[PDB]
Amino acid sequence: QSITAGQKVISKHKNGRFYQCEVVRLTTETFYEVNFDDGSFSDNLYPEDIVSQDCLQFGPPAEGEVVQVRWTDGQVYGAKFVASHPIQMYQVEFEDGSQLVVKRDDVYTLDEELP
């Protein structure tokens, strides 16, 4: 089942419960993968988290390129760029006006049983 924009669906609100919501847009989110200098691996960096070069302006680093990364703790780490992969996601709006950007697997059609 493809999900299309304008479709009523069911997904989890920010309060953690399933509600009907409406798909307002199909977006593409690009995630970066890097190997930190200590060998730990991240698969979901945003391009703007690369702080050794301007990837929002000039695209991803070359594969294997040395980079510095601003992590979710606000600190900067050395790493090496592994890959980038774009992911189709679904911007949904709930009855209260709140919105989320979610993965295909987190969206359910009205006809289907919920987990």
Swiss-Prot record:
Ubiquitous. Ubiquitinated by RNF8 and RNF168 following DNA damage, leading to its degradation. Degradation promotes accessibility of H4K20me2 mark for DNA repair protein TP53BP1, which is then recruited. Also ubiquitinated by the SCF(FBXO22) complex; leading to proteasomal degradation. Residues 1-58, 59-115 form the Tudor domain. It is found in: Nucleus. The record marks 49, 71, 77 as: Histone H3K4me3 binding. It comes from the Eukaryota. Histone demethylase that specifically demethylates 'Lys-9' and 'Lys-36' residues of histone H3, thereby playing a central role in histone code. Does not demethylate histone H3 'Lys-4', H3 'Lys-27' nor H4 'Lys-20'. Demethylates trimethylated H3 'Lys-9' and H3 'Lys-36' residue, while it has no activity on mono- and dimethylated residues. Demethylation of Lys residue generates formaldehyde and succinate. Participates in transcriptional repression of ASCL2 and E2F-responsive promoters via the recruitment of histone deacetylases and NCOR1, respectively. The 2 Tudor domains recognize and bind methylated histone H3 'Lys-4' residue (H3K4me). Double Tudor domain has an interdigitated structure and the unusual fold is required for its ability to bind methylated histone tails. Trimethylated H3 'Lys-4' (H3K4me3) is bound in a cage of 3 aromatic residues, 2 of which are from the Tudor domain 2, while the binding specificity is determined by side-chain interactions involving residues from the Tudor domain 1. The Tudor domains are also able to bind trimethylated histone H3 'Lys-9' (H3K9me3), di- and trimethylated H4 'Lys-20' (H4K20me2 and H4K20me3). Belongs to the JHDM3 histone demethylase family. Interacts with histone deacetylase proteins HDAC1, HDAC2 and HDAC3. Interacts with RB and NCOR1. Interacts with VRK1. Interacts with FBXO22; this interaction promotes KDM4A ubiquitination. This is Lysine-specific demethylase 4A.
